């Protein structure tokens, strides 16, 4: 699914991203339906922007703003998220 997030300057998107650090051997990772990406949503604030856009805990991040991040390390994915400022589009797959 694709979530479209557009927030106010002073607020957050309302989620916590967790996933593999670039310093680990991320080059050895092979995506599978049971673990489809390196980064995923640890939590989503209820009635936050991400929640209202349909994101939920356990969603694995496939794309950020059209860029595939399945095999991308944490800091680089965070950089792509922050690059859009108040606007963010994320393609995810739900583990649930």
């Amino acid at each position: 699914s694709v979530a479209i997030l557009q927030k106010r300057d002073h607020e957050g998107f309302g989620f916590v991203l967790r996933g593999a650090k670039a310093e680990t051997p991320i080059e050895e990772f092979t995506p599978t339906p049971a673990f489809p990406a390196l980064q995923y949503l640890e939590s989503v604030d209820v009635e936050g922007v991400a929640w209202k856009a349909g994101l939920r805990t356990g969603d694995f991040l496939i794309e950020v703003n059209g860029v595939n991040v399945v095999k991308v390390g944490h800091k680089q994915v965070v950089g792509l998220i922050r690059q859009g400022g108040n606007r963010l589009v994320m393609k995810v797959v739900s583990v649930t």
Binding site: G12, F13, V16, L17, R18, A20, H74, K75, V78, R82
Partner: peptide
């Protein structure tokens, strides 16, 4: 792993 709030 790292964790970042956004």
């Amino acid at each position: 792993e790292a964790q970042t709030r956004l």
